[PDB]
mmCIF file of C-alpha atoms in Angstrom:
data_model
loop_
_atom_site.group_PDB
_atom_site.id
_atom_site.type_symbol
_atom_site.label_atom_id
_atom_site.label_comp_id
_atom_site.label_asym_id
_atom_site.label_seq_id
_atom_site.Cartn_x
_atom_site.Cartn_y
_atom_site.Cartn_z
ATOM 1 C CA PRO A 1 91.245 -27.471 -14.985
ATOM 2 C CA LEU A 2 91.781 -23.919 -13.631
ATOM 3 C CA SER A 3 90.207 -20.808 -15.243
ATOM 4 C CA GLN A 4 92.110 -17.670 -16.330
ATOM 5 C CA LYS A 5 90.726 -15.767 -13.297
ATOM 6 C CA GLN A 6 92.036 -18.330 -10.743
ATOM 7 C CA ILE A 7 95.516 -18.452 -12.379
ATOM 8 C CA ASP A 8 95.771 -14.619 -12.223
ATOM 9 C CA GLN A 9 94.648 -14.783 -8.552
ATOM 10 C CA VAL A 10 97.505 -17.175 -7.541
ATOM 11 C CA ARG A 11 100.022 -15.127 -9.584
ATOM 12 C CA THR A 12 99.194 -11.916 -7.625
ATOM 13 C CA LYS A 13 99.651 -13.668 -4.242
ATOM 14 C CA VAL A 14 103.054 -15.001 -5.415
ATOM 15 C CA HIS A 15 104.120 -11.537 -6.660
ATOM 16 C CA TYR A 16 103.820 -10.146 -3.157
ATOM 17 C CA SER A 17 105.152 -12.668 -0.638
ATOM 18 C CA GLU A 18 107.212 -10.596 1.860
ATOM 19 C CA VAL A 19 109.213 -12.100 4.781
ATOM 20 C CA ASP A 20 110.354 -9.082 6.875
ATOM 21 C CA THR A 21 111.280 -10.753 10.204
ATOM 22 C CA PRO A 22 112.030 -7.452 12.093
ATOM 23 C CA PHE A 23 108.433 -6.254 11.422
ATOM 24 C CA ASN A 24 106.496 -9.445 12.210
ATOM 25 C CA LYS A 25 108.366 -9.478 15.562
ATOM 26 C CA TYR A 26 107.270 -5.970 16.694
ATOM 27 C CA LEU A 27 103.615 -6.640 15.771
ATOM 28 C CA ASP A 28 103.847 -9.907 17.773
ATOM 29 C CA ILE A 29 105.134 -7.957 20.825
ATOM 30 C CA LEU A 30 102.224 -5.493 20.424
ATOM 31 C CA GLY A 31 99.796 -8.451 20.321
ATOM 32 C CA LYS A 32 101.251 -10.336 23.310
ATOM 33 C CA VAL A 33 100.377 -7.198 25.315
ATOM 34 C CA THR A 34 97.085 -6.269 23.639
ATOM 35 C CA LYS A 35 95.668 -9.753 24.395
ATOM 36 C CA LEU A 36 96.748 -9.412 28.090
ATOM 37 C CA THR A 37 95.631 -5.788 28.704
ATOM 38 C CA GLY A 38 92.393 -6.436 26.785
ATOM 39 C CA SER A 39 91.776 -9.493 29.016
ATOM 40 C CA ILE A 40 92.332 -7.442 32.247
ATOM 41 C CA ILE A 41 89.744 -4.802 31.126
ATOM 42 C CA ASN A 42 87.311 -7.747 30.619
ATOM 43 C CA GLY A 43 88.305 -8.946 34.127
ATOM 44 C CA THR A 44 88.784 -12.582 33.010
ATOM 45 C CA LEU A 45 92.309 -12.473 34.581
ATOM 46 C CA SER A 46 93.401 -16.058 35.614
ATOM 47 C CA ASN A 47 96.953 -17.428 36.174
ATOM 48 C CA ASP A 48 97.878 -17.958 32.476
ATOM 49 C CA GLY B 1 102.770 8.229 0.028
ATOM 50 C CA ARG B 2 103.794 9.018 -3.565
ATOM 51 C CA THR B 3 107.433 7.792 -3.314
ATOM 52 C CA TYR B 4 109.107 4.707 -1.743
ATOM 53 C CA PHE B 5 111.298 6.975 0.400
ATOM 54 C CA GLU B 6 108.384 9.222 1.539
ATOM 55 C CA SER B 7 106.158 6.238 2.499
ATOM 56 C CA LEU B 8 109.024 4.758 4.580
ATOM 57 C CA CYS B 9 109.272 8.108 6.434
ATOM 58 C CA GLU B 10 105.505 8.044 7.182
ATOM 59 C CA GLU B 11 105.865 4.472 8.507
ATOM 60 C CA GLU B 12 108.669 5.599 10.882
ATOM 61 C CA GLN B 13 106.436 8.371 12.314
ATOM 62 C CA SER B 14 103.651 5.799 12.836
ATOM 63 C CA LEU B 15 106.145 3.504 14.705
ATOM 64 C CA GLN B 16 107.019 6.219 17.287
ATOM 65 C CA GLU B 17 103.444 6.911 18.498
ATOM 66 C CA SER B 18 102.821 3.174 18.968
ATOM 67 C CA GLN B 19 106.079 2.874 20.958
ATOM 68 C CA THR B 20 105.162 5.664 23.427
ATOM 69 C CA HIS B 21 101.691 4.164 23.963
ATOM 70 C CA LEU B 22 103.159 0.645 24.488
ATOM 71 C CA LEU B 23 105.730 1.905 27.020
ATOM 72 C CA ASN B 24 103.013 3.773 29.007
ATOM 73 C CA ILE B 25 100.748 0.669 28.891
ATOM 74 C CA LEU B 26 103.627 -1.468 30.271
ATOM 75 C CA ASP B 27 104.329 0.917 33.224
ATOM 76 C CA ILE B 28 100.599 1.042 34.161
ATOM 77 C CA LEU B 29 100.588 -2.781 33.911
ATOM 78 C CA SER B 30 103.565 -2.926 36.352
ATOM 79 C CA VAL B 31 101.775 -0.566 38.773
ATOM 80 C CA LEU B 32 98.638 -2.801 38.611
ATOM 81 C CA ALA B 33 100.634 -6.057 39.115
ATOM 82 C CA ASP B 34 102.945 -4.389 41.703
ATOM 83 C CA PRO B 35 103.082 -6.252 45.090
ATOM 84 C CA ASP B 36 94.315 -0.197 46.266
ATOM 85 C CA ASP B 37 93.477 3.431 45.254
ATOM 86 C CA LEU B 38 96.709 3.757 43.202
ATOM 87 C CA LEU B 39 95.783 0.296 41.833
ATOM 88 C CA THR B 40 92.157 1.473 41.310
ATOM 89 C CA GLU B 41 93.235 4.578 39.297
ATOM 90 C CA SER B 42 95.615 2.394 37.236
ATOM 91 C CA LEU B 43 92.856 -0.215 36.600
ATOM 92 C CA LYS B 44 90.965 2.673 34.829
ATOM 93 C CA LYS B 45 93.967 4.313 33.163
ATOM 94 C CA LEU B 46 94.576 0.904 31.479
ATOM 95 C CA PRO B 47 91.191 1.011 29.524
ATOM 96 C CA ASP B 48 91.841 4.679 28.809
ATOM 97 C CA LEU B 49 95.195 3.638 27.155
ATOM 98 C CA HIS B 50 93.451 0.722 25.390
ATOM 99 C CA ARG B 51 91.182 3.194 23.546
ATOM 100 C CA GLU B 52 94.462 4.232 21.788
ATOM 101 C CA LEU B 53 96.885 1.334 21.253
ATOM 102 C CA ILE B 54 94.672 -0.613 18.826
ATOM 103 C CA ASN B 55 93.913 2.528 16.785
ATOM 104 C CA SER B 56 97.649 3.383 16.567
ATOM 105 C CA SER B 57 98.590 -0.201 15.628
ATOM 106 C CA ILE B 58 95.843 -0.238 12.907
ATOM 107 C CA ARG B 59 97.691 2.606 11.231
ATOM 108 C CA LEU B 60 101.080 0.837 11.364
ATOM 109 C CA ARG B 61 99.872 -2.235 9.425
ATOM 110 C CA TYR B 62 97.990 0.019 6.971
ATOM 111 C CA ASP B 63 101.208 1.904 6.161
ATOM 112 C CA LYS B 64 103.176 -1.348 5.845
ATOM 113 C CA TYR B 65 100.892 -2.396 2.956
ATOM 114 C CA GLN B 66 101.057 1.151 1.549
ATOM 115 C CA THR B 67 104.847 1.026 1.463
ATOM 116 C CA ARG B 68 104.891 -2.457 -0.124
ATOM 117 C CA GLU B 69 102.641 -1.271 -2.991
ATOM 118 C CA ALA B 70 104.774 1.806 -3.767
ATOM 119 C CA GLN B 71 107.996 -0.252 -3.844
ATOM 120 C CA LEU B 72 106.490 -2.655 -6.422
ATOM 121 C CA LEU B 73 105.144 0.271 -8.512
ATOM 122 C CA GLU B 74 108.655 1.855 -8.583
ATOM 123 C CA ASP B 75 110.397 -1.465 -9.420
ATOM 124 C CA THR B 76 108.331 -1.782 -12.596
ATOM 125 C CA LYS B 77 110.144 1.177 -14.220
ATOM 126 C CA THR B 78 112.835 -0.334 -16.523
ATOM 127 C CA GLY B 79 116.101 1.387 -17.558
ATOM 128 C CA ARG B 80 114.820 2.332 -21.044
ATOM 129 C CA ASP B 81 111.954 4.424 -19.557
ATOM 130 C CA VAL B 82 114.347 6.607 -17.439
ATOM 131 C CA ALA B 83 116.656 7.413 -20.406
ATOM 132 C CA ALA B 84 113.790 8.631 -22.667
ATOM 133 C CA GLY B 85 114.635 12.315 -21.986
ATOM 134 C CA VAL B 86 118.417 12.342 -22.691
ATOM 135 C CA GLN B 87 118.985 15.755 -24.392
ATOM 136 C CA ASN B 88 121.511 14.809 -27.141
ATOM 137 C CA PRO B 89 121.105 11.369 -28.843
ATOM 138 C CA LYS B 90 123.592 12.247 -31.656
ATOM 139 C CA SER B 91 126.832 12.284 -29.625
ATOM 140 C CA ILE B 92 125.599 9.089 -27.961
ATOM 141 C CA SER B 93 125.211 7.395 -31.326
ATOM 142 C CA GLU B 94 128.546 8.704 -32.643
ATOM 143 C CA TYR B 95 130.352 7.492 -29.522
ATOM 144 C CA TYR B 96 128.770 4.057 -29.655
ATOM 145 C CA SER B 97 129.478 3.568 -33.368
ATOM 146 C CA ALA C 1 95.307 -14.747 46.130
ATOM 147 C CA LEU C 2 97.316 -13.989 42.963
ATOM 148 C CA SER C 3 95.056 -10.916 42.479
ATOM 149 C CA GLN C 4 91.667 -9.569 43.670
ATOM 150 C CA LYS C 5 90.681 -9.351 39.960
ATOM 151 C CA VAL C 6 87.746 -7.158 41.132
ATOM 152 C CA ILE C 7 87.023 -4.290 38.721
ATOM 153 C CA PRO C 8 84.927 -1.376 40.111
ATOM 154 C CA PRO C 9 85.168 0.879 36.940
ATOM 155 C CA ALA C 10 82.744 0.044 34.062
ATOM 156 C CA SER C 11 81.811 1.338 30.553
ATOM 157 C CA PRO C 12 78.304 1.235 28.860
ATOM 158 C CA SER C 13 77.695 0.789 25.073
ATOM 159 C CA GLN C 14 77.302 4.453 23.934
ATOM 160 C CA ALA C 15 79.944 3.987 21.183
ATOM 161 C CA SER C 16 79.491 3.668 17.365
ATOM 162 C CA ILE C 17 78.836 7.432 17.240
ATOM 163 C CA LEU C 18 79.501 7.664 13.445
ATOM 164 C CA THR C 19 77.748 4.270 12.915
ATOM 165 C CA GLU C 20 74.956 5.677 15.185
ATOM 166 C CA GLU C 21 71.255 4.882 15.773
ATOM 167 C CA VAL C 22 69.489 1.530 15.366
ATOM 168 C CA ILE C 23 70.376 -0.600 12.309
ATOM 169 C CA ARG C 24 66.590 -0.084 11.811
ATOM 170 C CA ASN C 25 65.763 2.415 8.985
ATOM 171 C CA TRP C 26 68.414 0.201 7.347
ATOM 172 C CA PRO C 27 68.281 1.289 3.633
ATOM 173 C CA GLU C 28 67.828 5.009 4.310
ATOM 174 C CA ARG C 29 70.714 4.982 6.793
ATOM 175 C CA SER C 30 72.867 2.878 4.465
ATOM 176 C CA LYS C 31 72.356 5.218 1.506
ATOM 177 C CA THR C 32 73.026 8.170 3.818
ATOM 178 C CA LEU C 33 76.319 6.595 4.896
ATOM 179 C CA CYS C 34 77.364 5.863 1.312
ATOM 180 C CA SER C 35 76.551 9.443 0.301
ATOM 181 C CA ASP C 36 78.472 10.829 3.278
ATOM 182 C CA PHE C 37 81.507 8.716 2.379
ATOM 183 C CA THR C 38 81.434 9.804 -1.265
ATOM 184 C CA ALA C 39 81.067 13.383 -0.008
ATOM 185 C CA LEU C 40 84.334 13.620 1.940
ATOM 186 C CA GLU C 41 87.493 15.016 0.367
ATOM 187 C CA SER C 42 91.097 14.995 1.583
ATOM 188 C CA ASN C 43 91.441 11.197 1.268
ATOM 189 C CA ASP C 44 93.638 10.979 4.378
ATOM 190 C CA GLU C 45 90.818 12.224 6.613
ATOM 191 C CA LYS C 46 88.495 9.689 4.978
ATOM 192 C CA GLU C 47 90.741 6.850 6.158
ATOM 193 C CA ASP C 48 90.379 8.109 9.727
ATOM 194 C CA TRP C 49 86.583 7.954 9.701
ATOM 195 C CA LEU C 50 86.690 4.533 8.062
ATOM 196 C CA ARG C 51 88.600 3.093 11.021
ATOM 197 C CA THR C 52 85.854 4.068 13.455
ATOM 198 C CA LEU C 53 83.060 2.702 11.278
ATOM 199 C CA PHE C 54 84.854 -0.559 10.647
ATOM 200 C CA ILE C 55 85.695 -1.296 14.269
ATOM 201 C CA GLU C 56 82.150 -0.361 15.233
ATOM 202 C CA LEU C 57 80.977 -2.838 12.609
ATOM 203 C CA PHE C 58 83.097 -5.633 14.052
ATOM 204 C CA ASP C 59 81.460 -4.855 17.377
ATOM 205 C CA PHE C 60 78.169 -6.188 16.004
ATOM 206 C CA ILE C 61 79.499 -9.434 14.521
ATOM 207 C CA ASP C 62 75.556 -9.956 8.349
ATOM 208 C CA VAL C 63 74.570 -10.183 4.689
ATOM 209 C CA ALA C 64 73.404 -6.572 4.911
ATOM 210 C CA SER C 65 76.894 -5.590 6.056
ATOM 211 C CA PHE C 66 78.359 -7.537 3.132
ATOM 212 C CA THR C 67 76.092 -5.674 0.715
ATOM 213 C CA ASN C 68 77.161 -2.401 2.346
ATOM 214 C CA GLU C 69 80.822 -3.298 1.817
ATOM 215 C CA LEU C 70 79.988 -4.142 -1.796
ATOM 216 C CA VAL C 71 78.452 -0.694 -2.285
ATOM 217 C CA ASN C 72 81.398 1.024 -0.599
ATOM 218 C CA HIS C 73 84.014 -0.817 -2.654
ATOM 219 C CA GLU C 74 82.122 -0.330 -5.925
ATOM 220 C CA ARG C 75 81.803 3.388 -5.195
ATOM 221 C CA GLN C 76 85.544 3.433 -4.510
ATOM 222 C CA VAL C 77 86.387 1.749 -7.838
ATOM 223 C CA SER C 78 85.524 5.030 -9.575
ATOM 224 C CA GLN C 79 88.801 6.388 -8.197
ATOM 225 C CA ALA C 80 92.249 4.929 -8.808
ATOM 226 C CA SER C 81 93.323 3.502 -5.448
ATOM 227 C CA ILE C 82 91.412 1.183 -3.127
ATOM 228 C CA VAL C 83 91.512 2.354 0.484
ATOM 229 C CA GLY C 84 88.444 0.572 1.861
ATOM 230 C CA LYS C 85 89.766 -2.855 0.947
ATOM 231 C CA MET C 86 93.172 -2.287 2.546
ATOM 232 C CA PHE C 87 91.564 -0.921 5.684
ATOM 233 C CA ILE C 88 89.279 -3.936 5.984
ATOM 234 C CA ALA C 89 92.342 -6.120 5.414
ATOM 235 C CA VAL C 90 94.061 -4.588 8.434
ATOM 236 C CA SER C 91 91.119 -3.965 10.771
ATOM 237 C CA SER C 92 90.054 -7.580 10.295
#
């Protein structure tokens, strides 16, 4: 048994699924550098 | 961000600032990992650049959601709504009949 | 020998300028912040300030912060769009 609120909540997530591969890739490049540069400022360093 | 086209333009402008920051961060990273003093100044310039890249990125994801919402709001307008203002219905009805 | 990994430069915690002071004086400061947020015009500029606050908040991390977010969102429901929620959704 699912209430009216929960059904509306799944419907809104379905109505918005986006799969833009070009975008997700650029954000991933930004992250693969933010995690490294942020680590160096901490000074944790280490050989990967 | 009123229109789908205008929001896409704002997103493009947010992409460029992030790109310049990223390229500068990469060059400083090369100087730091290059085979002191120059390396000491770089090891500080890198935190200076860090107080910038995350803020700029923040904005890019924010605009991505902004653009998605506007596109959905525009796609809800059906054909009937747009043709509400046609000036002369008459001729249209005569021609169709 | 891969790297010295020795860092002479350092930074102290003098940040959170807009989320300033002790969290002490909690309700007075919280109401002051809510009033200041409701005060601002030119929605764009508002977004800017929000960023700072929010990242400062994630520096600390709690239920008090959740109540504060409740107040902020509820105050924002009076207007059409919801900027605070989207900005939490990114800055998280």
